[PDB]
UniProtKB/TrEMBL annotation:
Mg(2+) binds at residues 67-68. Keywords: Metal-binding, Protein transport, Signal, Transport. Signal peptide: none annotated. Monomer. The lineage of its organism: Bacteria, Pseudomonadati, Pseudomonadota, Gammaproteobacteria, Thiotrichales. GO terms for biological process: protein transport. This is Outer membrane lipocarrier LolA family protein. The chain holds residues 52 to 205 of 205 of the full protein. It comes from Francisella philomiragia subsp. philomiragia (strain ATCC 25017 / CCUG 19701 / FSC 153 / O#319-036). It comes from the Bacteria. One of its GO terms (molecular function) is metal ion binding.
Amino acid sequence: NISGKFIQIRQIAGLNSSLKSSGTFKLTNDGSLLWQQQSPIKTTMQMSKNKLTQTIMDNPPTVLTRDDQPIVFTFTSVFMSVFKGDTKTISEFFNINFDGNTQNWTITLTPKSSPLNKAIKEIILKGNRYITNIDVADTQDNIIKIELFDITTN
Ligand SMILES: [Cl-]
Ligand SMILES: [Cl-]
């Protein structure tokens, strides 16, 4: 399995500040992702084969739907897929451009068709042995930038 820390900055074009959050993540080879936001409010996202849930503080988790939360479903799918080397699944829904080498690469993803291309403009991933940066731009001039660090394999 693979685990590390994240810092997340959300820039919505109409807001007068950026929204910052941070926490940890844990991936296992059996396709589970645990995304634990620790600041500024505790929240947890859990992905497994057939399910994505989100938990806010100590409230009951809710099951997310791809039709209501397309960007979260897309982000977690792409995140998992790149850690696993599963470019086949990515290429079903995205155009892929790879630039660089094993020590420094950038992957640019643009959606191939509707309805994904109504939600996402581009996803940019950068990294080395592991992903270090993920940026998600929606079609409304909003950007979410994530940095991954202190990554270890266990
Ligand atoms: Cl192929
Ligand atoms: Cl090169």
